[PDB]
Amino acid sequence: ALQQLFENNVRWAEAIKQEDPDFFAKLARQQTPEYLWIGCSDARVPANEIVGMLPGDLFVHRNVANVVLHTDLNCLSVIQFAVDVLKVKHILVTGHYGCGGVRASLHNDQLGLIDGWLRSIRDLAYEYREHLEQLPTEEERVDRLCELNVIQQVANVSHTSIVQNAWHRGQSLSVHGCIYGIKDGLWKNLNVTVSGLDQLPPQYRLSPL
Ligand SMILES: [Zn+2]
């Protein structure tokens, strides 16, 4: 029903201009979001709605299971643009419970190309296999791995030279880990926020350029 989307768009734009005739014109002059959202592509987790934000407020990357991989130039380019060009003050790594990508990493079905994309989550589940094994249900295991996954990605972001060099030059920048409940609409802090070099293990601290 593609036509509906066009009709929706026309109605949306016109309604906004009725309340604020300059909303788009002003926004178009400059991009100044204070946040980068890194989250899952899952249709149930749209960034702006969940945190009550407006067009212009959130720079967004979404991918399968919200992973930040060391040699993925897609996500790395979003982070670099956000930190170096836009100078966002916060990176919000948001995973969600019931994530299908995370769930697939606990099962042994072949999905195709995505096998490689998700294998770091499988590695994480293997790393924490004893911990996960204590949990009686598959849903509990999935949801805990969803949390562990967010925590790993926060660490990954904080280990980049992009983030560390921003800190080196006195830029204020925090990396947060949150988890969204698709069952209840609640966006919850995992309390793993990193805001400076002193919070990193020595093994990950890069010397300044
Ligand atoms: Zn997901």
Task: Report the alpha-carbon distance of residue 122 to residue 115 in Å, rounded.
Answer: 9
Q: How was this structure determined?
A: X-ray
Distance 166 CA to ligand 1 centre (A): 29
Indicate the length of the chain as a whole number: 209
Distance 69 CA to ligand 1 centre (A): 16
Rounded to 5 degrees, φ, ψ at 3 are: -60, -35
Task: Report the alpha-carbon distance of residue 181 to residue 141 in Å, rounded.
Answer: 15
Decide if 131 contacts 172 (C-beta within 8 A): no
Distance 3 CA to ligand 1 centre (A): 28
Distance 11 CA to ligand 1 centre (A): 30
Active site residues: 40, 42, 44, 96, 99
Nearest to 103 by CA among 134, 69, 137: 137
3-state secondary structure the chain: CHHHHHHHHHHHHHHHHHHCCCHHHHHCCCCCCCEEEEEECCCCCCHHHHCCCCCCCEEEEEECCCCCCCCCHHHHHHHHHHHHHHCCCEEEEEEECCCHHHHHCCCCCCCCCHHHHCHHHHHHHHHCHHHHHCCCCHHHHHHHHHHHHHHHHHHHHHHCHHHHHHHHCCCCCEEEEEEECCCCCCEEECCCCECCHHHCCHHHCCCCC
Per the structure, the complete domain to which residue 37 belongs is given by 1-209
Work out how many domains the chain is built from and give that number: 1
User: For the domain that residue 192 is a member of, what is the CATH number?
Assistant: 3.40.1050.10
Decide if 177 contacts 192 (C-beta within 8 A): yes
